[PDB]
Short mmCIF file of C-alpha atoms and ligand atoms in Angstrom, two decimals:
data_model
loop_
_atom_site.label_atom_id
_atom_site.label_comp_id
_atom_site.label_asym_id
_atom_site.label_seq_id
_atom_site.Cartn_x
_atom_site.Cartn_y
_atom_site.Cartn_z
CA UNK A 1 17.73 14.57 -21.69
CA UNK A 2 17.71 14.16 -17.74
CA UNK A 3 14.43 12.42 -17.74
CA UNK A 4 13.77 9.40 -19.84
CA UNK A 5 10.64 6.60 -19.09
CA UNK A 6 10.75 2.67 -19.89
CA UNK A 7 7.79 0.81 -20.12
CA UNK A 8 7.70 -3.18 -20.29
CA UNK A 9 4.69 -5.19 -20.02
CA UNK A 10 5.29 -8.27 -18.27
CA UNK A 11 2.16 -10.31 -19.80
CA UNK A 12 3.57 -9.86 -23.68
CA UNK A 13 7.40 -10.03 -22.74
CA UNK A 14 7.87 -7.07 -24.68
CA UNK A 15 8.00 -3.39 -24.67
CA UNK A 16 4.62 -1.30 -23.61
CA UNK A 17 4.32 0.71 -26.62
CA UNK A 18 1.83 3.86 -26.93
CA UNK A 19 1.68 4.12 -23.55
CA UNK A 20 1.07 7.94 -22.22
CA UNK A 21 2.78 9.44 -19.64
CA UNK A 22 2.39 13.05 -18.05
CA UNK A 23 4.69 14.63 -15.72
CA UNK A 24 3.57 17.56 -12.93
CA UNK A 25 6.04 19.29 -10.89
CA UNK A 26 4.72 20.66 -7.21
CA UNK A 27 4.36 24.34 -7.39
CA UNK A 28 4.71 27.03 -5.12
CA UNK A 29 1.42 26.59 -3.84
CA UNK A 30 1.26 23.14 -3.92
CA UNK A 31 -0.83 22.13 -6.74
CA UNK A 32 0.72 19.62 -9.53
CA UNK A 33 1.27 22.13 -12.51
CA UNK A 34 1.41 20.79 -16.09
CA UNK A 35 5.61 19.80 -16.47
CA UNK A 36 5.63 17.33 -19.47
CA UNK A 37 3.89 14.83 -21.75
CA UNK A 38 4.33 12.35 -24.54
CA UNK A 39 3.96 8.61 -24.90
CA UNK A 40 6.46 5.53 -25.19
CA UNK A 41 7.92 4.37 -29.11
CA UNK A 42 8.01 1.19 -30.43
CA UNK A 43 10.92 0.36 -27.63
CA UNK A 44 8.85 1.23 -25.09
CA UNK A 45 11.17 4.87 -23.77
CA UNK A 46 9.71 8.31 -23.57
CA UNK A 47 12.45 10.54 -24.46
CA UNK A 48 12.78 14.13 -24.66
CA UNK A 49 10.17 15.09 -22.11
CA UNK A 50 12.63 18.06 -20.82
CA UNK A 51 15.82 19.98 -20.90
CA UNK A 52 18.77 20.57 -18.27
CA UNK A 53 18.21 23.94 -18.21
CA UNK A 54 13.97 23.23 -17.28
CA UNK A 55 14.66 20.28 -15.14
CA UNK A 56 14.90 22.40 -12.17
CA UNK A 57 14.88 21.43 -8.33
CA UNK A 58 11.41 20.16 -7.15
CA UNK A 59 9.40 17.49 -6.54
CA UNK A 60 8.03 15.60 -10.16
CA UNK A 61 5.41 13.24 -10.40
CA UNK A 62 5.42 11.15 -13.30
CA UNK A 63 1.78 9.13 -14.35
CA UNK A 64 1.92 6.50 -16.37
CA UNK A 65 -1.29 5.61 -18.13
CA UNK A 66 -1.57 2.23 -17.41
CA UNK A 67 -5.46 1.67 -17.57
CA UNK A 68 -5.22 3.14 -20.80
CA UNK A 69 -2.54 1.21 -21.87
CA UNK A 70 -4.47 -2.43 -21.06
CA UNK A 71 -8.13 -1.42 -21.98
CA UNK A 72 -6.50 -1.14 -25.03
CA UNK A 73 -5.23 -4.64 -25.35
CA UNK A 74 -8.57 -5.64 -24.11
CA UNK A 75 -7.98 -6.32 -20.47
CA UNK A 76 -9.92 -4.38 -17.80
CA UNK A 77 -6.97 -3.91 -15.51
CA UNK A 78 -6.65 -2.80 -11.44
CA UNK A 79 -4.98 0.51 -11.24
CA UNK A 80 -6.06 3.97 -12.88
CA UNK A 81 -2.39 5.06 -13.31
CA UNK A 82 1.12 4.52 -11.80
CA UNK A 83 2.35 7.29 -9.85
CA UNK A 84 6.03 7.83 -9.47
CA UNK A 85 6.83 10.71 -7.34
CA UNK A 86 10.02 11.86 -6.59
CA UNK A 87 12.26 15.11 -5.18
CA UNK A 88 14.84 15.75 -8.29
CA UNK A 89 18.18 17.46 -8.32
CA UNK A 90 18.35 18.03 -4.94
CA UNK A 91 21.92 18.17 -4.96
CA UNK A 92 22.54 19.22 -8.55
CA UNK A 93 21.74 18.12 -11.93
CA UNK A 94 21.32 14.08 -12.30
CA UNK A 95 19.96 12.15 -14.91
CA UNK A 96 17.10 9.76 -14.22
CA UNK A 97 14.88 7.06 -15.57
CA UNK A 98 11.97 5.61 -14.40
CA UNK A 99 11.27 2.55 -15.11
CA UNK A 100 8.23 0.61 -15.23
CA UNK A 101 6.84 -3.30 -15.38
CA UNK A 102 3.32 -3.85 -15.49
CA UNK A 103 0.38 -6.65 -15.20
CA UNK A 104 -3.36 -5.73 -15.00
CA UNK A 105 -3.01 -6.33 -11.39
CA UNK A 106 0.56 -5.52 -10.38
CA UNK A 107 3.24 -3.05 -11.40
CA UNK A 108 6.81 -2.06 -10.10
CA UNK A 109 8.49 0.37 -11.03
CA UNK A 110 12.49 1.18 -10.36
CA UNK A 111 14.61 4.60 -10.49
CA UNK A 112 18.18 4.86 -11.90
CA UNK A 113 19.89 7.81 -10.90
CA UNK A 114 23.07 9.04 -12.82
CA UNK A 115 25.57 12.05 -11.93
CA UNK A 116 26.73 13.23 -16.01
CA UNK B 1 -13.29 -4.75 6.42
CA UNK B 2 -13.32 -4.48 2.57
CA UNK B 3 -9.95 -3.02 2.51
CA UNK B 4 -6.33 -4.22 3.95
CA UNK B 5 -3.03 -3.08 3.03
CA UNK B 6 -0.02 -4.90 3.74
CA UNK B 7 3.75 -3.40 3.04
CA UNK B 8 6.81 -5.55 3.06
CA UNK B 9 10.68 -4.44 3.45
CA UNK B 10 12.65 -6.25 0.82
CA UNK B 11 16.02 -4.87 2.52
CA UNK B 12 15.63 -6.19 5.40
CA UNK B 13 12.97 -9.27 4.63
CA UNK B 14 10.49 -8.25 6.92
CA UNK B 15 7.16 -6.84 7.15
CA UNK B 16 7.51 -3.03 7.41
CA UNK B 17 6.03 -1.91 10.96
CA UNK B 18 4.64 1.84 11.59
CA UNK B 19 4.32 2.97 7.78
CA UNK B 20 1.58 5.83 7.95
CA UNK B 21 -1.06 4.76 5.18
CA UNK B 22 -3.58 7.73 3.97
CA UNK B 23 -6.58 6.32 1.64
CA UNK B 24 -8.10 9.45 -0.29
CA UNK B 25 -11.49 9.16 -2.60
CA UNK B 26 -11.94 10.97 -5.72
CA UNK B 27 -14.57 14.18 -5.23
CA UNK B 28 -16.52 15.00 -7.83
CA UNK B 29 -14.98 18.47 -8.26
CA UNK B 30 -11.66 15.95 -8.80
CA UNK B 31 -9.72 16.49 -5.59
CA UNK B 32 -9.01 13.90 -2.85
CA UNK B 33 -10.86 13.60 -0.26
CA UNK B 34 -9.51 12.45 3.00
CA UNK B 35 -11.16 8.51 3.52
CA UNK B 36 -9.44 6.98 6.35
CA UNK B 37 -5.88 6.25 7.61
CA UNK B 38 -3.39 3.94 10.12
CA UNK B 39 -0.11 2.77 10.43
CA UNK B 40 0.58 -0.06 10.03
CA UNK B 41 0.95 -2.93 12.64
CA UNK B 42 3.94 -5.62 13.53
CA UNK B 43 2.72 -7.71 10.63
CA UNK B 44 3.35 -4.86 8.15
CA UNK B 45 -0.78 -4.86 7.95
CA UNK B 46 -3.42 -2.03 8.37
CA UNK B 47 -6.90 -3.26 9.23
CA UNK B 48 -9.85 -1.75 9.82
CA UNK B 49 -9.60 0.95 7.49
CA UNK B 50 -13.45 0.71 6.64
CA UNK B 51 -16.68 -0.74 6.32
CA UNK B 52 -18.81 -2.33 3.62
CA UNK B 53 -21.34 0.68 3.98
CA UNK B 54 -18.82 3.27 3.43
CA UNK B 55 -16.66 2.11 0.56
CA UNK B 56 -18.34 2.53 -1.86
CA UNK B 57 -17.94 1.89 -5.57
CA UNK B 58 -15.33 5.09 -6.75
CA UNK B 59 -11.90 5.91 -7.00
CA UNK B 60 -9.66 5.53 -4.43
CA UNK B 61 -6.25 6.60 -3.72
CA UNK B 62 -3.90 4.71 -0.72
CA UNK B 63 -0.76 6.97 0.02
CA UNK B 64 2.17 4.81 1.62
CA UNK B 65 4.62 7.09 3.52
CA UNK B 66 7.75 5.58 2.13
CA UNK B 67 10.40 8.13 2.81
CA UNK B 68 9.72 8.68 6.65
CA UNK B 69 10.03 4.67 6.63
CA UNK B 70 13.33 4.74 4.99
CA UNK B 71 14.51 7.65 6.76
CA UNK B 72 13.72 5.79 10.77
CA UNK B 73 16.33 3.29 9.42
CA UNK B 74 19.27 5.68 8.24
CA UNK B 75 18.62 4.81 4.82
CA UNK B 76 18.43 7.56 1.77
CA UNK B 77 15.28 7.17 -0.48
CA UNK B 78 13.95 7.90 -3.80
CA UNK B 79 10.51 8.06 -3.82
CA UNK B 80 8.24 10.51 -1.43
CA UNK B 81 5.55 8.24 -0.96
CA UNK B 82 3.91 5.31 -2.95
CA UNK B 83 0.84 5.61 -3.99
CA UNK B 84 -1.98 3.22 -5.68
CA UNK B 85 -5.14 4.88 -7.64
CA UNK B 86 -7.78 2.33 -8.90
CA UNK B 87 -11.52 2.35 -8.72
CA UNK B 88 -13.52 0.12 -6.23
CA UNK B 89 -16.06 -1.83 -8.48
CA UNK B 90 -19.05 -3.76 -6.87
CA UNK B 91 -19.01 -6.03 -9.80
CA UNK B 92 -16.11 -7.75 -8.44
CA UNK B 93 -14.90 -10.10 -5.01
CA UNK B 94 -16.06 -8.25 -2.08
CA UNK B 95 -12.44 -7.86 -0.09
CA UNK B 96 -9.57 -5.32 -1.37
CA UNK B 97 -5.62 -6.16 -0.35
CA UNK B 98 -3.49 -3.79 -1.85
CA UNK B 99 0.41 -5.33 -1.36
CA UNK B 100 3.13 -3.09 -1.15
CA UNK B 101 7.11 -4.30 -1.43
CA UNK B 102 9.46 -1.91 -0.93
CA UNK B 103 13.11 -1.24 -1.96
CA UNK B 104 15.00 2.19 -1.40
CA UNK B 105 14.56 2.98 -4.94
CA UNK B 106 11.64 0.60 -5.99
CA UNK B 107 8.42 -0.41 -5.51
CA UNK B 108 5.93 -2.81 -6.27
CA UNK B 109 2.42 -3.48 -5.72
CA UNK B 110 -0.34 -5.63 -6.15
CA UNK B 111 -3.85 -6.33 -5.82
CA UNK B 112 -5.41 -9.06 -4.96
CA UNK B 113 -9.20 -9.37 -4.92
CA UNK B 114 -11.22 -12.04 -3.64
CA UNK B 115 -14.23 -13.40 -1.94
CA UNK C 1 5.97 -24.86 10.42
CA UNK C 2 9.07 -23.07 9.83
CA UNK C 3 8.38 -22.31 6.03
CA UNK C 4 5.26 -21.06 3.80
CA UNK C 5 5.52 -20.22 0.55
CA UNK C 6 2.61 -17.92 -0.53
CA UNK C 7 1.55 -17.59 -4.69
CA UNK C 8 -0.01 -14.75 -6.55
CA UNK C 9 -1.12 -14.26 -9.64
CA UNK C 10 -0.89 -10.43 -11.07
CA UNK C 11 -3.10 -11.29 -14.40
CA UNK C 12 -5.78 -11.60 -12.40
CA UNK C 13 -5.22 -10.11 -8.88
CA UNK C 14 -5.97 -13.48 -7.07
CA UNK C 15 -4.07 -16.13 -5.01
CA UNK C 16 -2.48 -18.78 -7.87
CA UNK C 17 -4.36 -21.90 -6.79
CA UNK C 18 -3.56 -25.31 -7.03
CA UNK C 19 0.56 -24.56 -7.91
CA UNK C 20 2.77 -27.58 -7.14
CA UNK C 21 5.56 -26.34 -5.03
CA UNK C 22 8.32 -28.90 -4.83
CA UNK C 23 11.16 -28.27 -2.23
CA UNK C 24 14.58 -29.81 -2.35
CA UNK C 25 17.84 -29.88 0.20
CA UNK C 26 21.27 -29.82 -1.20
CA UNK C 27 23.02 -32.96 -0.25
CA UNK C 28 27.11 -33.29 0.67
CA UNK C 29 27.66 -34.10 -3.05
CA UNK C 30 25.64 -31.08 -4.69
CA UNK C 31 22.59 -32.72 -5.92
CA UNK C 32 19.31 -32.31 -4.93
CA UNK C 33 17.30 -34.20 -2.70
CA UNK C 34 13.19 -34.09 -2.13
CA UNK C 35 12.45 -32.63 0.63
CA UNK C 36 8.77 -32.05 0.91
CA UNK C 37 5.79 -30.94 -1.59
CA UNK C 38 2.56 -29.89 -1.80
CA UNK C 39 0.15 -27.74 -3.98
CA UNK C 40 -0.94 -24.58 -2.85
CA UNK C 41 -4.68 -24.21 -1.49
CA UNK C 42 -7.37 -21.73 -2.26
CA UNK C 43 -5.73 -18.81 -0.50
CA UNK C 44 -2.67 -19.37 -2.90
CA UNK C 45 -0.25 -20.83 0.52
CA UNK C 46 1.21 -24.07 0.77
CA UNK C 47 1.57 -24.95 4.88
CA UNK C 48 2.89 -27.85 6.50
CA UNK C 49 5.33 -28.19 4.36
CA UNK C 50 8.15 -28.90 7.46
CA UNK C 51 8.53 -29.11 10.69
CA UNK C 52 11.37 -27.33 12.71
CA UNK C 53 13.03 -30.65 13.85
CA UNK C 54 13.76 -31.36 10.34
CA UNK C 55 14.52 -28.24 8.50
CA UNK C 56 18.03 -27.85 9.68
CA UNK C 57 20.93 -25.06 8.14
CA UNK C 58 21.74 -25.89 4.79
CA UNK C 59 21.09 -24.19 0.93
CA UNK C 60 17.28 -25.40 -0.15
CA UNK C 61 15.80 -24.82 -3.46
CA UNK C 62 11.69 -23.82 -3.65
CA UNK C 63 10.46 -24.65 -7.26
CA UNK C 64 7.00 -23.28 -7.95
CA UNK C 65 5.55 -24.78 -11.11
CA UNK C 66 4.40 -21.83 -13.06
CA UNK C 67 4.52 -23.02 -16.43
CA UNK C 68 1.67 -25.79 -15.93
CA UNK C 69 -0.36 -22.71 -13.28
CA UNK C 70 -0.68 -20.57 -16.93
CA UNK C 71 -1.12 -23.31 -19.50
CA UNK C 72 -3.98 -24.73 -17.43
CA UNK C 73 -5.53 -20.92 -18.00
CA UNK C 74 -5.03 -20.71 -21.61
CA UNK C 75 -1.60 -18.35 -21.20
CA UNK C 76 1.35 -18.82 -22.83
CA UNK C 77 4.05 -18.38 -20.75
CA UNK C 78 7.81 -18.10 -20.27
CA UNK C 79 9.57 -19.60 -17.47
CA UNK C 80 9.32 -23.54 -17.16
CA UNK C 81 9.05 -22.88 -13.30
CA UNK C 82 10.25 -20.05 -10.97
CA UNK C 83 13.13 -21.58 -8.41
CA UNK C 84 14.24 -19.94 -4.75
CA UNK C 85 17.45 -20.97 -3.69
CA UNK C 86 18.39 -19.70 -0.40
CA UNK C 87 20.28 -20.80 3.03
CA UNK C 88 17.80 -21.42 5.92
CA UNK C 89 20.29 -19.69 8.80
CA UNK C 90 19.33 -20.38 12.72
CA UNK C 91 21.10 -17.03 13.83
CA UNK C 92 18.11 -15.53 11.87
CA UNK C 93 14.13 -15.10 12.43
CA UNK C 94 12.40 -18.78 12.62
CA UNK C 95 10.05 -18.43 10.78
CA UNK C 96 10.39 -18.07 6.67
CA UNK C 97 7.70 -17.13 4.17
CA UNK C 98 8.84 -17.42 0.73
CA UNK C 99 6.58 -15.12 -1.47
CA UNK C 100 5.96 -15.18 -5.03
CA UNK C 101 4.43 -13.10 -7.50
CA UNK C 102 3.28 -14.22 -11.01
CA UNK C 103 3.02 -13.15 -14.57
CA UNK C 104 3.63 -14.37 -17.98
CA UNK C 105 7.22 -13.19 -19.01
CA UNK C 106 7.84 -12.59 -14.92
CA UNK C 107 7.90 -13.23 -11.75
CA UNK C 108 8.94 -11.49 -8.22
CA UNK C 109 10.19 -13.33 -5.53
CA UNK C 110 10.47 -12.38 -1.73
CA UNK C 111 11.58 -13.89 1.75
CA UNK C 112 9.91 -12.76 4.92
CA UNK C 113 11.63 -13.71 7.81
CA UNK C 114 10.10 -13.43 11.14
CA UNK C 115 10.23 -14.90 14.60
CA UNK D 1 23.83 -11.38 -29.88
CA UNK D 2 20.36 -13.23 -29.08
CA UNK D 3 20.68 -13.50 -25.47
CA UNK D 4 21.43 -10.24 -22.94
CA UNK D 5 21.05 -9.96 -19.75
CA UNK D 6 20.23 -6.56 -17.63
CA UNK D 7 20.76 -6.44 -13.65
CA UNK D 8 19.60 -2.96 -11.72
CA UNK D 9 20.41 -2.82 -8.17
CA UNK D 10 16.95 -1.49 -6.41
CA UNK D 11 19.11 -0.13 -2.89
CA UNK D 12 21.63 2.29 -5.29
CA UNK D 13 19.14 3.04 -7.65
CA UNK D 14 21.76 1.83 -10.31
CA UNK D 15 23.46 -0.83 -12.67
CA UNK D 16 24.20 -3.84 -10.94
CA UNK D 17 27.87 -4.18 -12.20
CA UNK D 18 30.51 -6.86 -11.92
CA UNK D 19 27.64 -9.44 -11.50
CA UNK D 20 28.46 -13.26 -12.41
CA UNK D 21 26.43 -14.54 -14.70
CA UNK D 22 26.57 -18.37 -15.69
CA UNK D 23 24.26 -20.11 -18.16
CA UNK D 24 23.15 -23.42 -18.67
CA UNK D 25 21.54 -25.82 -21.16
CA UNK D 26 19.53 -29.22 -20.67
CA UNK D 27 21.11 -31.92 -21.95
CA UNK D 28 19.91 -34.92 -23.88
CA UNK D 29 20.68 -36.86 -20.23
CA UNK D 30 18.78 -34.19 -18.76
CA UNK D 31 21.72 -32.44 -16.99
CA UNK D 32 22.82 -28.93 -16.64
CA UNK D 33 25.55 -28.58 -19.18
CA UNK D 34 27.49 -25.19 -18.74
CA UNK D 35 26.62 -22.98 -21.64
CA UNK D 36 28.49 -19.84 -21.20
CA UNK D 37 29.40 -17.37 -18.39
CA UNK D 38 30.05 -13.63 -18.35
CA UNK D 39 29.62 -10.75 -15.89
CA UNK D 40 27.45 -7.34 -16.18
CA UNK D 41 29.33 -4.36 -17.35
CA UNK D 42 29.12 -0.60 -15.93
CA UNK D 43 25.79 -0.26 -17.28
CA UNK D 44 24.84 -3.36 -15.49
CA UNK D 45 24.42 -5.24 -19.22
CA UNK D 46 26.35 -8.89 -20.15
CA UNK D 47 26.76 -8.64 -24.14
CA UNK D 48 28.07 -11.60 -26.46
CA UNK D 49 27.11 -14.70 -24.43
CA UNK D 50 26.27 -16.44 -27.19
CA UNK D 51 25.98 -16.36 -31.13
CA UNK D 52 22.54 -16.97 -33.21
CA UNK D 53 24.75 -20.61 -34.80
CA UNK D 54 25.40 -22.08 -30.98
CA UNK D 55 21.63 -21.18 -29.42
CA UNK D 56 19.96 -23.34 -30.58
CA UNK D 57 16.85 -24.72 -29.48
CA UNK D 58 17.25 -25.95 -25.82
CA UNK D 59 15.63 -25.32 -21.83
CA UNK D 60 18.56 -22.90 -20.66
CA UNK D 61 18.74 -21.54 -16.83
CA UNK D 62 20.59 -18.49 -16.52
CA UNK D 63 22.36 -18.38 -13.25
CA UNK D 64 22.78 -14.88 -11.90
CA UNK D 65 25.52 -14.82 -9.02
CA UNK D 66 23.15 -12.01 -6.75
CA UNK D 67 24.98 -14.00 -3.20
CA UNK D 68 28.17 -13.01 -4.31
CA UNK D 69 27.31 -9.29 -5.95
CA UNK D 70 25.73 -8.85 -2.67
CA UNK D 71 28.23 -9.50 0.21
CA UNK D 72 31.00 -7.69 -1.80
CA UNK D 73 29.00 -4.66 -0.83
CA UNK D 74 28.73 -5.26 2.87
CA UNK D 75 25.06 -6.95 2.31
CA UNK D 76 24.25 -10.52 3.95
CA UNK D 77 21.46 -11.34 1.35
CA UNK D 78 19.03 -14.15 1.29
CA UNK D 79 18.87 -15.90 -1.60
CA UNK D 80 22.01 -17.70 -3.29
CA UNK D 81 21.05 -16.93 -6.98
CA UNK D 82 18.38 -15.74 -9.57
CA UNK D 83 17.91 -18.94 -11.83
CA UNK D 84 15.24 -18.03 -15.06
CA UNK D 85 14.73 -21.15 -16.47
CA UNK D 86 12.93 -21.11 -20.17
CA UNK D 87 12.72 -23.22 -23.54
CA UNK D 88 14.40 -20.67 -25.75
CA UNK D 89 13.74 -20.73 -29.74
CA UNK D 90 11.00 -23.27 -30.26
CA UNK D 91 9.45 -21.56 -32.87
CA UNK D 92 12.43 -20.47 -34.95
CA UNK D 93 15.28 -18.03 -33.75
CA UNK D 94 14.34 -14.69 -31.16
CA UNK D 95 16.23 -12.60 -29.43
CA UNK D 96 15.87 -12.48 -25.43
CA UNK D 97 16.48 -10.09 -22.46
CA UNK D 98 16.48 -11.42 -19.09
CA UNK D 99 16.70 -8.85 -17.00
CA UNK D 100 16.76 -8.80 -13.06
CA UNK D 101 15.96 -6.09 -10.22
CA UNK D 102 17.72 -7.60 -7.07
CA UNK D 103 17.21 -6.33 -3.23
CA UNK D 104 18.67 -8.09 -0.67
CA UNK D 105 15.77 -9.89 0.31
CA UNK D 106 14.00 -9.99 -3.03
CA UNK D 107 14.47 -10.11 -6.47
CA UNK D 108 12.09 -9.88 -9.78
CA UNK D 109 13.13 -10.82 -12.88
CA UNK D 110 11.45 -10.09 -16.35
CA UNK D 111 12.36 -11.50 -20.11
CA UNK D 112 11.82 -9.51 -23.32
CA UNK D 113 11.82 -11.16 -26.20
CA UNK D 114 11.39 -9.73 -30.26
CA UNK D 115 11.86 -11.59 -33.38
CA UNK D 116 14.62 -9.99 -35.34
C1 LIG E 1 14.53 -4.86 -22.76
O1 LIG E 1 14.62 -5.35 -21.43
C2 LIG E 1 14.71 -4.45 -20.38
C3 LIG E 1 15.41 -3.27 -20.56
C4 LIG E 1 15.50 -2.36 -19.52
O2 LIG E 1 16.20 -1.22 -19.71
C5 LIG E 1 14.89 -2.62 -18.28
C6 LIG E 1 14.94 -1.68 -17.11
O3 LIG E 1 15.53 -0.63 -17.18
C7 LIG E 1 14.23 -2.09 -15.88
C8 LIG E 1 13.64 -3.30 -15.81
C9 LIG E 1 12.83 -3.81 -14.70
C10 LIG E 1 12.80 -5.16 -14.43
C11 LIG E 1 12.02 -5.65 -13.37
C12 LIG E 1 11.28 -4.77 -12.59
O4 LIG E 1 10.54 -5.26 -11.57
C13 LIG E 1 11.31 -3.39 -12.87
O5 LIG E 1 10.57 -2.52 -12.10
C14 LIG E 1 12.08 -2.92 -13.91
O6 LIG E 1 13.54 -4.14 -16.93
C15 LIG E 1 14.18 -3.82 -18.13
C16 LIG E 1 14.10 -4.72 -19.18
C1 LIG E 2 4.28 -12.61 4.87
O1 LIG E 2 4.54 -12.85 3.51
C2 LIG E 2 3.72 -12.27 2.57
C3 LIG E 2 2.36 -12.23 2.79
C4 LIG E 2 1.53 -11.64 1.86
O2 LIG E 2 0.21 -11.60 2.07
C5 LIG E 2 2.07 -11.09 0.68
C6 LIG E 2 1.25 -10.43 -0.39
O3 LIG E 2 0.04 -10.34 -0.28
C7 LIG E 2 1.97 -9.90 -1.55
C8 LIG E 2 3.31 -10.04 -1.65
C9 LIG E 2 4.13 -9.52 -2.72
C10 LIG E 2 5.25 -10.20 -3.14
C11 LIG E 2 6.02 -9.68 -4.18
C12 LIG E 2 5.66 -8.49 -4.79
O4 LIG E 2 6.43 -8.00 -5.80
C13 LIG E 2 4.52 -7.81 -4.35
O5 LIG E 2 4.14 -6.62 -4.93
C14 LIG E 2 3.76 -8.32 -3.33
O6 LIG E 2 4.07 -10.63 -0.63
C15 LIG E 2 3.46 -11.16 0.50
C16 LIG E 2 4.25 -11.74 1.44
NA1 LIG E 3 20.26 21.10 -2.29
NA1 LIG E 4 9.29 -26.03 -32.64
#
């Protein structure tokens, strides 16, 4: 898979399981059409959102959940979602994984950006 | 002002001057309104964004024009922009800073709420 | 004052108050020597710290003490204290602002370096 | 191995590889006594530090050289190291990640630790 998604949650020291994540790509006209879904395992990584041959050119935005994720746990936290947005494949086929560290009030998040 | 947002360069260790900043607010049909905007100043800081009459409790969405920062400097980027969605809450301290610290390929940010 | 060092806390989106900050200068023979100290105030910054007669070139270590910040909130942390080790430079900016940013299991740390 | 450590490099938008890595542990005098040392691999990973029979329970600082991965790249960074400093194994034997996401001016660092 060219896409993958890590989730860590810096107040457990541990991986942010069960944590969903949705993925738009910009269309044609501009709106954020439906791409991919699914929601982090036990180690925290969402894998198997796409293909090669769907992974197309175009600008993705990948949400992560993260209110979701902390009511959860009990915490009322700061942000609705993360928002990761990104132009992919620009110059061919790469793989990528977003990576994500979040507090209630804080979260960073990192690409890494392979060529296969 | 109940609302400040402050972006820092971790490249060069540095506040990052002239970063165009869009703040959006959730309509009820969904879509994002246009709220207010700047760019921000030598200390890496937009001010002024709004008043305490206007911001009202909602949610909000601050846009930080990453790329065209990265870009001025020569410098490739990954993300288009950063953006930060959370709801204003009157519950809560009174004054919003939402902290941005960029890389070319990372991002973190913060908020810190107080009194 | 030629150095700040600025706390937050991302548990709870507010300045970390009351932090002991210790900072240290290398000496000739590797060890560390006291330099100055403080506790950081109710905006989460620790000024005064130096002045720029004494805080000459040389490798300085910033220890924030994070471990006794979370215990006295209930929260079990990780790190027995988060250290910044860095060369103060007079080619560079004058003035330095050594940021950091807190949780449990991490931390982020930043320089700002500005004239 | 209980103890791996995990450097990205947030500029590249990669593994941080062929970074130093030295470790320490407290001594009964209260010094640093050297531990073990390594460097990160291709994927930016430092395997086989240590073995569950020599880490025990201890304060350990783990030492990552970011000066030196830095100006080998044509980068004048700030900071001479990442130190993470942490009591490791108080309550019986885990397993920890430290992992690191260094920028010239900036670094965050994050531990992840599971009981095997
Ligand atoms: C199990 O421990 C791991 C494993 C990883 O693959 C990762 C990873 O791929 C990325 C990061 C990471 C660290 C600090 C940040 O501020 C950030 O945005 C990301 O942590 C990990 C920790
Ligand atoms: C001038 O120095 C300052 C001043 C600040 O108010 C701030 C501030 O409000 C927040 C942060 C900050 C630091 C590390 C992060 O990972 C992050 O997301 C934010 O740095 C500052 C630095
Ligand atoms: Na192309
Ligand atoms: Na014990």
């Amino acid at each position: 898979c060219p896409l993958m998604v890590k989730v860590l949650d810096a107040v457990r020291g541990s991986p942010a399981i069960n944590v969903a994540v949705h993925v738009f790509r910009k269309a044609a006209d501009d709106t954020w059409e439906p791409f991919a879904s699914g929601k982090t395992s036990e180690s925290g990584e969402l894998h198997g959102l796409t293909t090669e041959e769907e992974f197309v050119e175009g600008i993705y935005k990948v949400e992560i959940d993260t209110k979701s994720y902390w009511k959860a746990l009990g915490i009322s936290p700061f942000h609705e979602h993360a928002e990761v947005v990104f132009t992919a494949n620009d110059s061919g086929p790469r793989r990528y994984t977003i990576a994500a560290l979040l507090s209630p009030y804080s979260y960073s998040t990192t690409a890494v950006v392979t060529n296969p």
